[PDB]
Amino acid sequence: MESNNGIILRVAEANSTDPGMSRVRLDESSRRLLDAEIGDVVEIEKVRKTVGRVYRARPEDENKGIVRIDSVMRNNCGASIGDKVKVRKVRTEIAKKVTLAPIIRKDQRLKFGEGIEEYVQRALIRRPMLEQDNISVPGLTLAGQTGLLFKVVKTLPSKVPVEIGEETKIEIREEPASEVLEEVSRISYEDIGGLSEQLGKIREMIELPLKHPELFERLGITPPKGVILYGPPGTGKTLIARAVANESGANFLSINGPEIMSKYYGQSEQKLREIFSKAEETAPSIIFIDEIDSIAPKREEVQGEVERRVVAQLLTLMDGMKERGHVIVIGATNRIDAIDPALRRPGRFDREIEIGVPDRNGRKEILMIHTRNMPLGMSEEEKNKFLEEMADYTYGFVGADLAALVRESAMNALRRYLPEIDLDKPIPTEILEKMVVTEDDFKNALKSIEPSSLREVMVEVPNVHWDDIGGLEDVKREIKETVELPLLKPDVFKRLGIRPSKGFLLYGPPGVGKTLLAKAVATESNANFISIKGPEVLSKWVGESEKAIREIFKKAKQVAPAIVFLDEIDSIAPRRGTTSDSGVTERIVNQLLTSLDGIEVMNGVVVIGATNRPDIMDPALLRAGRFDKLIYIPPPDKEARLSILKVHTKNMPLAPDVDLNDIAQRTEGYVGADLENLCREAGMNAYRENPDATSVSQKNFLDALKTIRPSVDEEVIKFYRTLSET
Amino acid sequence: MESNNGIILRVAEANSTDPGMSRVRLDESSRRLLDAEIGDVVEIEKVRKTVGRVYRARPEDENKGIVRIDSVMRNNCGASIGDKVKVRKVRTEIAKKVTLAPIIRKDQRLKFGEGIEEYVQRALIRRPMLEQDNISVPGLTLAGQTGLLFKVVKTLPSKVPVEIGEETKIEIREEPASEVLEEVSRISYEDIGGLSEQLGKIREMIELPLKHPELFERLGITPPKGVILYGPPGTGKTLIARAVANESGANFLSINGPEIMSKYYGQSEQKLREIFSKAEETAPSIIFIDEIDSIAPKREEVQGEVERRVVAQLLTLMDGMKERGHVIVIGATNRIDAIDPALRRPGRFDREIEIGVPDRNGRKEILMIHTRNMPLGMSEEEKNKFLEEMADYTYGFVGADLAALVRESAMNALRRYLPEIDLDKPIPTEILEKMVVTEDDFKNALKSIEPSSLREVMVEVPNVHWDDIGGLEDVKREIKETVELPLLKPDVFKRLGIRPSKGFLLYGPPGVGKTLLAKAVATESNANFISIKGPEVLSKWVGESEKAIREIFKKAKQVAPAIVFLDEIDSIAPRRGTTSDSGVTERIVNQLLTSLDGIEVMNGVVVIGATNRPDIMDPALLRAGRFDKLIYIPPPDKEARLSILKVHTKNMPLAPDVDLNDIAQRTEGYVGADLENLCREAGMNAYRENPDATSVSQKNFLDALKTIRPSVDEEVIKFYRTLSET
C-alpha cells in the first residue's frame, strides 16, 4: 500500500498537523521521485477510489522515505495509516462558485452564522479542497470544537478537486445539510495527542492487534486478549479509547463502572451482558471498561455477592469470547492497586503498560489543538507560531488542566469583549473578528491561572557539563569509569573476571552542588536521571506511602537505561537536624534496604549514594555489599573557585576592569553553591544594562565579596578529617 | 462591558444597597446625558414592555454607560442584570387617593393591624412608582424583616404611573391582593454582602450559558458542569447559591446531604434520581448541595457500599447529563482538603471557587443590608452611624455572625420596649412610634455573648503606601529594584542574562512593622500582598499541618503576579531567639524551598520571606532562585525619626506650641514603635479638653523622653551585621 515516493506515497502522521491541513509536508527527493516540484498544488487520488488534493510544503526533520500527511484531510476523503495514494503534478481548474452548508444535527437547527462575508472570504486564499466533500472551516472562538464544519455541495468546476481563489463568489445555503463523510463527533490520535513516542508506542500495542482486516486486524498472530491503561486519570487518557475507535475503523462501546454499580442485581449484570452480547452482531467493535477497578476492586475486601458475580460474569464473558467476532477488550484505571490476580492472566488480559504525563512536547500538541479548537481551525496559510514559546514555559499540568485553563483564557477575553455587545442573536462579524485568541492574547490571558496538580518525580535529562561546576576532576574521572565501563565495556569484565561495585557513596560539605555532579555524569552518559531527595520522601510520607518510594525503582527499572541517584536518604533523620522525636532508625529505611538489594545494575541502572554527612545516617544503612566504594567530595579549592565562577560570570554581564584572579585568591572555606550567589550578588548592585543606571566593573564584583564571603563553613571540613578515621 | 450610553442606558445592579427604594443613582456626567436635575422623576421603559419611574441620585464612582438601580423595580419588572434599558424624562403625574394591600404569600392571609400613618405616611414622602406595582416600606426592627410588601390594586387616577406626594389620601384594607410579584425573601444580588469581585466572577460563568446557550456553548467557551464553594459555610453559601439561581431566572432545586445519608438503599438513590428527573423539565436550572462534604467526604476509610453506591450513583448522574438542556450543580464546604478528589475531575465538578471572609470593608456592605430594613444608615444620632464605626469592634466576623449580632440587637431593643408596655394581642401604632433603635443595643450586644470563640484563621487586606508610612529610603529603593523591576520588566531581564531576583528576605530590627514597608511597595506596584501572621504558623506547626500554610501561599500563586509576604513563617525558630536548637531546616521550609523553585515563568512572581532572626535560615533559602537578595534595615536614621515622629503626632490633637526638630534631637536609637508611644502618651498627660490653642505641649514631649529607653539593643545588632557581610 505505502511506497516510499512516487505516484504512490507513504501516508504518515504530521506532528504539527501542518500549519494548514492542505499544507502537507514533503521531502525534496519525494518530489523528484514523483517528478513534481515542492511549493505547488498537486492532485491526489487515493484508495477507496476517491478524489482530493493538497499543497506540498517544506520538509522539517523528515525522513526521505515517508510523507507526513494530516489525518483530517486523509480521513475527509477517507483513509488510514498504511494506505496507498495516487498523485501527480496535474493542476486542474480553479473553483469559481462554491455552495456550502453546515451540519445541522449537532446544531439541531440553531444559530446561523454570517461567515459568508466574515470568514470564508478572508480565509479563502488558495485552499486546496474537494467537490462533494465536507471542508473544515476555521473561526468561532474555542468551543472545544474542531474548526467549523461546512459541507461542500458543489463547486462550479465539476467532478475535479480544486482550490478556491479570491475571484470566487461563495454561497452559504443556510439550509439542511450533513457531512459527506466521517461525522460531527470525530477525533484522531493527533487531535488527542498528549505524547509522541509513547502514544505511538501505545498505538502499536493496540494497533498490531487492531490494524485492518486485509492485514492483521483479523488473522492469527496469537494477538493479546485485553488491555489496561494507567496514569493520568481523565484528561487525554480517558479519551484514548474514544480515539482508538475512529482511527481503527470499528464500533465503539463505552462501559463505565459506576453505571454498572449504579444498577443493582438483575439488570446490572444484564446490562453488562447485553453490551457484550450486543458486540457480536455489531462486530468489529472495541470493548472498553473505564472504571473496571470499581467492578473488580477486590484484594481481600469483599462486601457482597453482587460484586463477585459481575466480575465473575465478566470472567465468563472474556473466556466466552474466542475473538471469533474479534471484539477486543480494553481497560483503564488510575491505579493497578485495585486489580485482582485473576485479571492478570491470558484469556482475560494480556498487554498492560503505564502511561506517563506530558513533557514540554506533550503540552505543545495539546496547546496546538487549542489554537485549532480556537479560530483558525483549518488554517488558510502558513504562519510562524509564537505559541512555540508557551510549551517551554509551562509545566506541572496535564491535558485537562490546559484545556480548562484555555477556557480560563477565553473568559478573560470574553469578559471584556462580547458582554459589551450583549448578544440576543446574531453576532457582529466585526466584533467577532476583532476579538483574537491568536498569538497575541495568550500572554495577557496567561497572567491569570487557576491550575492545581499533584504528581511524583520522573526521569529527566539535565544540561550539566564539566564547566557548570568545575574542580575535582579526580572524582569525575572515576565517575566516568563507574558508568562507562559497566555501560560500554561489559566484555572487559570477562577478561578481568570481576563483579563491579553495586554502587558508591558520596559525602562531603553541603552546597558543593552534589546534585550538579549527579546531573553531570547523567548528561555525559546520556542516561535518564532520577534523583530521590528528602522533600519528596517527606511529601509522599504524608499519605503514608513507603511502597511508593520502592516503586520509584520499579518505575526507574522500566524506563532504564537510567541513573538512579540517592541523596538525603532516610530523610526523617536529616530533616530534624540535631534533635529527633524517634530513634536512629525506623520502619522507613527497612523499605529502602530491601530495595537496594532488589534493584540490579546489570541494566543501564546506576546506583549513586549521597549524603550531607554519613555519621548521622544510621551506620547499618551504610554497610558494604550495597555501596562498595566510599567516595569523599571535598570542597572546591582556590583554583576551582576561579574556573567555577569564570563559568558562571561569562554567560552574564562582565567588564574588562574585572580581574577574576583577585577574587578567588581571597576566599577559602567556601562552597560552590555560593559561587552561584557570589556571581549574582554584584549584579543586584550593578548590571551592564539595568534600570539602576549603574554598570559592571571591579566595583560591584568587589561589592559581591563584601555582600557575600565565607560564612565560617570550616566546621564541616574538620569533621571529615576525623570522620574518615573512625 | 456594561456599556450603553446617552438618553438610553443599560441596567446595572446598584453597587450599594441604598437607603431608598426609588433611588436610581447616576453620575454628574450620566445626568448631563438626559439633561435632568438630581432627584428628577424619569420614567424608564425596558424589555418585556414594563415601565417605571425613579429618582436620580449620584455616586462619584460610576461610569456614564450604566444605571445603578433599585432591586424593587428590577424585581417588579423581573429583570436580569445586563439588559439594555430606555429611559427618558417625563413630568410628574400624582395620585390623589391610593389603595394598598399586601400580597397573599408574604402574609399568608394571617396579617392585620395598625400603622397606616406609621408606614405609609412616613413612606408617603416622594415615592415615584408605576400603577399596579408592589411597593415596599421597611423600618422598625430587623431579623424577621425584609421590606414590607404592598401590592397596588388601584390608584384613584387610573392607567397612569404616578409619584406619591404629601397631598394624597392613603388606605390600608388588609384584604386580598395579587401575588404575582416575588417576595424579597427570594433573593436579590444586593442581599449578598460585599464580595463584588466574586459575585460577578461566579455569575458570568453560570449566567451566559443559562441565558443563551446557543452561542456561549456553541460559538464560545464550554459550559462547565458544577461549581464548589469554599470558606465558612451556612452563612453565604446557601444564600449565594439561591442568589445565583433566583436572579438568573433558573429554577432552584434543593438537596440535603444529611437527608440522603438519613436515607438508605432505595430512597437515597431514588431522590438523586428523582431530582434530576424533575430537573429535565425545568432545565436549565440550578442544582445545589450545601452539604457536599457530608455525603462525599470519602478519603478511603469510609465503609459501606450503600454510601459508595449513592456517591457512585452521583458519579454516573453527572456524566449522564447531555450539556444541552444543561443544568448546573452547585456545592459548598468549609474546606477543600476534607472533600473527595474523585469529585474534582471532569465529568463532574472541575470548577472550584474560594470565598473568603469579610473585613472592616466587607462588613460595611453586610451591615448595610441589615441597615436598609432599620433606620441606622444615615446619622441622626450622637454616634457615627456610617457602619465603619460599628465595623471596628466586629473584626473577624462573617455574614452569619453579624446577622446574629443585629438579631440579638433587636432582642436588646425588644427587651426595653415590649416588657415595659407588655402587650399581648394588640398591635398599636404607638409601640412602633415609640420604638427607635439606639446604639446602646449594639453596645449591650457587643458586650453580650456575641464575641464567643475566635473561629478560624484569616488573611488581611493591605492599605499602606508611601503616604501612610515613612522609614528608611535605602531599603525601599532596594526593595523596588527587587520587586518593581522583575514585575514590570521581566521580559528584557530574560534576554540580558540579568536576573536581579526571584524572591527576597527582610531582616532587621523588629517592632517597627517592617511589613508596612512591604505593603507600601506592594500597593504601589499594584501587586497582591499577603501576610502570614506568626501565631497562625505557631499553632498549626504543632498540629502537624503544613497544608493550611500552603493554601494561603497557593492562593497567591494562582492569582499571581503577586507579592506574598511571610512574617516569621519559621516562627518556631525565632522563638528560640539567637540560635536554632534543632536544625536550621524544618517541615515548612522544605516546601518553601520546593515552592520557590517550583514557580514558573508563566507569571512574574516574587516571594517574600521575613523574620526577626535571619541567622536561623536554611542555607538553601539564601541561594539562587529562592532568596537572591538579602535586605537589611539598619537602625532608624536621625532624619527618619523626625519624620516618623511628625506623622504620628498630627493624627491626634496638635498645636504649633512645639519645635518638631528639638524633640528629635533628644531621640537617638528610638524606633518607630518608640516614637509612636511618645505621641499618644503626651496628649493623654496633656489637656484633655481645652479652649486654648494648645492641646499637646513641648513640655509633654520633652518630659516623656526622660522615662523611656531605646528599644533596639546592641547584641541583636551584631548578629545582623556579620550575616549581611557574609
UniProtKB/Swiss-Prot annotation, chains A, B:
Binding partners and assembly: Homohexamer. Forms a ring-shaped particle.
Q: Which Pfam families match?
A: AAA (PF00004), AAA_lid_3 (PF17862), CDC48_2 (PF02933), CDC48_N (PF02359)
Q: Can you name a GO cellular component term?
A: cytoplasm
The UniProt record gives the binding positions of ATP as 231-238, 508-515
SMART domains recorded = AAA, CDC48_2, CDC48_N
Which keywords does the record carry?
A: ATP-binding, Nucleotide-binding, Repeat
Report the GO molecular function annotations: ATP binding; ATP hydrolysis activity
Q: What is this protein called?
A: VCP-like ATPase
UniProt family annotation: Belongs to the AAA ATPase family. CDC48 subfamily.
- Which domain of life does this protein belong to? Archaea
Give the gene that encodes this protein: vat
Indicate the temperature dependence noted in the record: Optimum temperature is 70 degrees Celsius.
Q: Is ATP-binding one of the keywords UniProt gives this record?
A: yes
